[PDB]
Design a protein around this ligand. Structure first.
Ligand SMILES: CC(=O)N[C@@H]1[C@@H](O)[C@H](O)[C@@H](CO)O[C@@H]1O
Lengths: 214, 96
């Protein structure tokens, strides 16, 4: 029979899915972006076209909805699937330190591990302390003598005998104190060098342990 | 086009942010100091930043006609929906 009303509707959809319709009807009549399809007066074997646009506002899971014309038994079953996952060539087996796998050119870390190469483990808060790799807001990293590893300074090694770079900001060492008689702090028989201050053994005094108690 | 990346740490999180986002999968692309989110940008940004075309991940929504009786055609459709990107397909009505 001549079909004087073709309403295209869908059944109930989640919040996450929206559908609109353009109706290209046989009357020289077109409607755009409406919540249902609507054409008045379809002739015998004269086809009309609805364009259905479906948008998700997030990644949904496999599910289906149906579109039907009211009063007719035929049905369009619309299977919906997410298009959120990437399709990347990755390698199974460094350089996430065993605490992760690569995926699309970056490491994906296991539970209780962070950092680009999964080199750090999680604390209570870890990377927030990276301001605690700078002695103050406007200072360089670890006094230029260390690297920030997991929001904490790891000081550079030294080859110089008796020298160690230490401190929260690698700001200290065990050789830059005042000298006396050739050796730092008067040599090990008189005192010890710590962060520029000589710590004199019982018996000796002065900035470089040059004197005896008087 | 348009891409905002707050807390983007993976390719998937990037694609989820919005339809104008794409992801550079080339290891070469990043240096020690850069955050992972620099891989997530519009196509033109990544391209003139040195990402090759064949390493830019950018999955798109599409309609797939699966099975195609009388008045409503097709009977079955499959849609892959990237968030914020419409998939479109046509339904033909017919009668006698
Ligand atoms: C991509 C697609 O299927 N869209 C079509 C459009 O190309 C065509 O203009 C119309 C037929 O008039 O039906 C839909 O709107």
């Amino acid at each position: 029979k001549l079909s004087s009303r073709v309403f295209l509707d869908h059944n109930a959809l989640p919040d996450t899915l929206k559908v609109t319709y353009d109706s290209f009807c046989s009357n020289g009549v077109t409607h755009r972006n409406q919540p249902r399809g609507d054409c008045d007066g379809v002739q015998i074997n004269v086809p009309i076209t609805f364009q259905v646009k479906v948008t998700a506002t997030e990644c949904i899971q496999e599910q289906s909805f149906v579109i039907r014309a009211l009063g007719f038994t035929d049905i369009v079953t619309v299977q919906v699937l997410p298009q959120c996952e990437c399709r990347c060539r990755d390698q199974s087996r460094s350089l996430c330190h065993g605490k992760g796998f690569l995926e699309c050119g970056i490491c994906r870390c296991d539970t209780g591990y962070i950092g680009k190469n999964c080199e750090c483990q999680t604390q209570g808060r870890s990377q927030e302390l990276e301001g605690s790799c700078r002695k103050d807001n406007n200072s360089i990293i670890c006094s230029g003598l260390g690297d920030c590893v997991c929001g904490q300074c790891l000081c550079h090694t030294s080859d110089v005998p008796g020298k160690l770079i230490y401190g929260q900001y690698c700001e200290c060492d065990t050789i830059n104190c005042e000298r006396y008689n050739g050796q730092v702090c008067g040599g090990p028989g008189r005192g010890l060098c710590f962060c520029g201050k000589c710590r004199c053994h019982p018996g000796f005094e002065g900035s470089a342990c040059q004197h005896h108690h008087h | 086009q348009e891409c905002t990346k707050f807390k983007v740490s993976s390719c998937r999180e990037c694609i989820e942010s919005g339809p104008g986002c794409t992801w550079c999968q080339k290891l070469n692309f990043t240096g020690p100091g850069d955050p992972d989110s620099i891989r997530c940008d519009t196509r033109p940004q990544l391209l003139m930043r040195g990402c090759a075309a064949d390493d830019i991940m950018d999955p798109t929504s599409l309609a797939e006609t699966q099975e195609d009786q009388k008045q409503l055609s097709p009977q079955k459709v499959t849609l892959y929906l990237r968030p914020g990107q419409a998939a479109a397909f046509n339904v033909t009505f017919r009668r006698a």
